[PDB]
Amino acid sequence: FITRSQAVRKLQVSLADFRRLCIFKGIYPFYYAKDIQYLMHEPVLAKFREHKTFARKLTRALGRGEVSSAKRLEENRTLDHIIKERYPSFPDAIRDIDDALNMLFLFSNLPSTNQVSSKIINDAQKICNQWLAYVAKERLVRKVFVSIKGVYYQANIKGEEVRWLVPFKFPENIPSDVDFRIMLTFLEFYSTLLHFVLYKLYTDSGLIYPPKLDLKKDKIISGLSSYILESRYDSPVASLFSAFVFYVSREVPIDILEFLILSCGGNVISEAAMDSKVTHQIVDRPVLKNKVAGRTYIQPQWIFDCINKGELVPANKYLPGEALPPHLSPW
Amino acid sequence: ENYQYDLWGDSTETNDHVMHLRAPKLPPPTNEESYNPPEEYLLSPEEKEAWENTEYSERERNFIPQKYSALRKVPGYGESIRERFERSLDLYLAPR
Amino acid sequence: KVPPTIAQFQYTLDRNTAAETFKLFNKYRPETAAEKKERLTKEAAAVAEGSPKPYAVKYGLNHVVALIENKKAKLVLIANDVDPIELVVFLPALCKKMGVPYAIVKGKARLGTLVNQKTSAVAALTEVRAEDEAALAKLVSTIDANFADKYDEVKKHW
Amino acid sequence: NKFVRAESIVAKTLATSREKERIKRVSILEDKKAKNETQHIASGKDFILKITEGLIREKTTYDGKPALLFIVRVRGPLAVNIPNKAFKILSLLRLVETNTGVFVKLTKNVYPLLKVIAPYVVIGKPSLSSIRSLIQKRGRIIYKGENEAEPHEIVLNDNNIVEEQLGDHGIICVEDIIHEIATMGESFSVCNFFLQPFKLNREVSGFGSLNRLRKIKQREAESRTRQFSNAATAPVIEVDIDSL
């Protein structure tokens, strides 16, 4: 048995690069001697050393005072084949996609900062939007759980029952304790895997990939509903609210509610969207000053309970301002 | 024009040939840590003080259950990043 | 001690004057291999589908020496850390005899950075644009008082 | 600590003198225009220039209609000490902090003031989606902390805080502030003060090896996109501020 020090000495690789290789190979710790020998042949290590040498070359070019040379060196410069061996079959990738989805959702809400490139945040947001569009089109969601740390969304992709957490839309705190470098390396692999899986699903059974954002709608209603795509009943969650227009007040976020209703098959319009067959409306204010009978005023909890049950329970214990019933875990 | 190829293709076999692929140990379902949980799990001031007394690494119950009849009343959560970072660290930084 | 001809170095352009000279020289960087290649490829592509001399600094030792003794060169830079000192001992005296102003700059490596070469040991300029001709003349005039008048007794200090 | 070079101070003095000369002329022209001294001026009316992506410019006459605007600091001119005339305006608008932003409402009187400080900042009309994203993902809020002190400007952590601070104008959640900012609501000024700064993320924030080249590219692209016209009659330059 060898240790991390011996592996680093033999591989002649940096600590960060060593951690990246271990993550890409899942070499859990002492370290597996029989696996380090196989790790001795790795094109990723060759690419890392080439990039390290290119960094020194670029520093030399900058020091010599030649912008054109630096530009040429920078322009003249993957995990695709790594996934081939660590995910033997699609079901395993689907099962392990929980962590990738959670990381992407968490990073999509992270504000841009010096420690995290804005491009990474944009890519994470795009991946999350693509995943939301795919889920809505397939209506594979079966249960919804709301928690203090977010909404514990889950999907039944091929019966996997994956549970992906959706963080609340709020300014995310940035504690210095978390090392973004490791998080960035994890996010890169997770994003590549999610892109591969989304492309495969879209081509095999889904829609055109990659989907393009609705430019006209992206100016006003950017989000899940701002996506346009085209192709080329198994649960109540895919049949509830059929053709029902579920209005939403300004208090509740349309992005969360719109996803569920669109997956079920209904429609959602928010008062702030403009900034009709309005059969239902959601209100959370202490006083229903509007006091309109045309729009059925029901607390949003009934949508979650109906989705988790499927019987379209009436608004008995859902009146505006009325205490909601306990949200018992469906598991 | 990248990623336009079936990475997996036809495949119906698992890693059972080499049993070193430890299970990811994905987190189990929730335990009533909802924004509107049963009133019996409404942490009392004494229970809240006891929970606050415990420090990190000894908080198996890592949530303070509370009832919020209004969605707007839900407070913001800033510890999500730290908890998931700890999970990522523990994913591969533990002997197996 | 060193002979009178040696120690004529170690007295060189000051930081301000050296910085000004580098700034003026940095405006006449000769076309590098990549720039020349891309320009020639663009010209060929334009020709297939259907300007005056490029002013630049002179740095080759043979080319610089040939420019000197002909009064063509207007300014000359001398590297002080040249390992074969014999290559540079006669350059200052030769320039003085020819009356061509020159300024010694510390560091062959520093000198070479202005021509995209590791080391050149020499640098000079003959052609200059109108926008920079006045600056070059002012720098040459300043260098006179900076160096020649400050070390008129350079023959001493064995 | 660091020694001050003669060249640097001389350059600062020259740039300050040029900016003061420009600002005096701009103020005189604006005062004459306010007095309706159309007898002899370069242009009776005013224009707002727009730059969009290859790169083309657009010019349109100023329209007397209020509109929501966002302004961010551009960190310059590089070597000009801000004169008191513009320093007071910047301090009042609290945009002096580098890379900081704030929302304002366009008005007939506001536009001349913006014209004077237009080079110092970047202005434009952000989209509704961009405004919503910025509000829900950023924005400082000064409040009294728990009991004693008020340094906690971090974030709008809880909606109940917004209800407590004001409670009266129906501002109970962040979406209310978003609506009052997008729409020409009366509470725009109230919430505008509540969110004095908008500390947008700065640039690459470092030098590094490749980061130095990235910074150089950004600086050279700024000259090709932004430009210090210095003309007393320079039309206001609008850009796609949402590109961030």
From Swiss-Prot, chain A:
Would the keyword Nucleus be found if you checked this record's keyword annotation?
A: yes
Report the record's Gene Ontology biological process terms. maturation of 5.8S rRNA from tricistronic rRNA transcript (SSU-rRNA, 5.8S rRNA, LSU-rRNA); maturation of LSU-rRNA from tricistronic rRNA transcript (SSU-rRNA, 5.8S rRNA, LSU-rRNA); maturation of SSU-rRNA from tricistronic rRNA transcript (SSU-rRNA, 5.8S rRNA, LSU-rRNA); ribosomal large subunit biogenesis; rRNA processing
BRCT domain: which residues?
Answer: 236-320
- Where's it found, cell-wise? Nucleus, Nucleolus; Nucleus, Nucleoplasm
Domain of life where this protein originates: Eukaryota
Q: Disruption effect?
A: Essential gene. Reduced assembly of 60S ribosomes and accumulation of halfmer polyribosomes.
Describe the effect of residue 261 to R: Temperature sensitive mutant
On induction, the UniProt comment says: Expression is down-regulated prior to the diauxic shift.
GO cellular component annotations of the record: nucleolus; nucleoplasm; nucleus; PeBoW complex; preribosome, large subunit precursor
UniProt-annotated stretches for the region Sufficient for interaction with ERB1: 30-331
State a single Gene Ontology molecular function: RNA binding
Main localization is nucleus
Q: Which UniProt keywords apply?
A: Coiled coil, Nucleus, Phosphoprotein, Ribosome biogenesis, rRNA processing
Mutagenesis or variant effect for residue 302 to R: Temperature sensitive mutant
- Give the record's family classification: Belongs to the pescadillo family.
On subunit structure and binding partners, the annotation says:
Component of the NOP7 complex, composed of ERB1, NOP7 and YTM1. The complex is held together by ERB1, which interacts with NOP7 via its N-terminal domain and with YTM1 via a high-affinity interaction between the seven-bladed beta-propeller domains of the 2 proteins. The NOP7 complex associates with the 66S pre-ribosome. Also interacts with NOG1. May also associate with the origin recognition complex (ORC complex).
The name this protein carries in UniProt is Pescadillo homolog
Swiss-Prot record, chain B:
Q: Where in the cell is it found?
A: Nucleus, Nucleolus; Nucleus, Nucleoplasm
Annotated region (Required for interaction with NOP7), positions in chain:
1-80
Top-level division of the source organism's lineage: Eukaryota
Subunit comment for this entry?
A: Component of the NOP7 complex, composed of ERB1, NOP7 and YTM1. The complex is held together by ERB1, which interacts with NOP7 via its N-terminal domain and with YTM1 via a high-affinity interaction between the seven-bladed beta-propeller domains of the 2 proteins. The NOP7 complex associates with the 66S pre-ribosome. Also interacts with NOG1.
Q: What else is known?
A: Present with 2680 molecules/cell in log phase SD medium.
Q: What does this protein do?
A: Component of the NOP7 complex, which is required for maturation of the 25S and 5.8S ribosomal RNAs and formation of the 60S ribosome.
Query: Can you tell me which family this protein belongs to?
Result: Belongs to the WD repeat BOP1/ERB1 family.
Name of the protein described by the UniProt record: Ribosome biogenesis protein ERB1
Gene source species: Saccharomyces cerevisiae (strain ATCC 204508 / S288c)
Its taxonomic placement starts with:
Eukaryota, Fungi, Dikarya, Ascomycota, Saccharomycotina
- Point out the gene that encodes the protein: ERB1
Q: Which residues of the full protein are shown?
A: 304 to 399 of 807
Curated annotation (Swiss-Prot), chain C:
* Quaternary structure, from the entry: Component of the large ribosomal subunit (LSU). Mature yeast ribosomes consist of a small (40S) and a large (60S) subunit. The 40S small subunit contains 1 molecule of ribosomal RNA (18S rRNA) and 33 different proteins (encoded by 57 genes). The large 60S subunit contains 3 rRNA molecules (25S, 5.8S and 5S rRNA) and 46 different proteins (encoded by 81 genes).
This chain's function reads: Component of the ribosome, a large ribonucleoprotein complex responsible for the synthesis of proteins in the cell. The small ribosomal subunit (SSU) binds messenger RNAs (mRNAs) and translates the encoded message by selecting cognate aminoacyl-transfer RNA (tRNA) molecules. The large subunit (LSU) contains the ribosomal catalytic site termed the peptidyl transferase center (PTC), which catalyzes the formation of peptide bonds, thereby polymerizing the amino acids delivered by tRNAs into a polypeptide chain.
Q: What is its main location?
A: cytoplasm
Of the intact sequence, the residues represented are 70 to 233 of 256
According to its UniProt entry, one GO biological process term is: cytoplasmic translation
Q: Name one GO cellular component term.
A: cytosolic large ribosomal subunit
The subcellular location is: Cytoplasm
Miscellaneous comment as given in the Swiss-Prot or TrEMBL entry: Present with 238000 molecules/cell in log phase SD medium. There are 2 genes for eL8 in yeast.
GO MF, one term, reads: structural constituent of ribosome
Q: Which domain of life is it from?
A: Eukaryota
This protein is called what?
A: Large ribosomal subunit protein eL8A
State the species of origin. Saccharomyces cerevisiae (strain ATCC 204508 / S288c) (Baker's yeast)
Cystine bridges: none
Stretch forming the signal peptide? none
Curated annotation (Swiss-Prot), chain D:
Judging by the UniProt lineage, the source's domain of life is Eukaryota
* MF-aspect GO terms: mRNA binding; RNA binding; rRNA primary transcript binding; structural constituent of ribosome
Report the principal subcellular site.
nucleus
Query: What's a single GO CC term here?
Result: preribosome, large subunit precursor
**GO BP:** exonucleolytic trimming to generate mature 5'-end of 5.8S rRNA from tricistronic rRNA transcript (SSU-rRNA, 5.8S rRNA, LSU-rRNA); maturation of LSU-rRNA from tricistronic rRNA transcript (SSU-rRNA, 5.8S rRNA, LSU-rRNA); ribosomal large subunit biogenesis
Subcellular localization(s) per the UniProt record: Nucleus, Nucleolus
Membrane-crossing residue ranges in chain numbering: none
Q: Does the keyword Acetylation apply?
A: yes
Q: Phosphoserine is carried by which residues?
A: 205
Going by the UniProt record, its keywords in alphabetical order are: Acetylation, Nucleus, Phosphoprotein, Ribosome biogenesis, RNA-binding
Q: Which family does it belong to?
A: Belongs to the universal ribosomal protein uL30 family.
Q: What else is known?
A: Present with 7720 molecules/cell in log phase SD medium.
What's this chain's function?
Answer: Involved in the biogenesis of the 60S ribosomal subunit. May act as a specificity factor that binds precursor rRNAs and tethers the enzymes that carry out the early 5' to 3' exonucleolytic reactions that generate the mature rRNAs.
Instruction: Specify the protein name.
Output: Ribosome biogenesis protein RLP7
Gene designation:
RLP7
In the complete protein, the residues contained here run 53 to 317 of 322
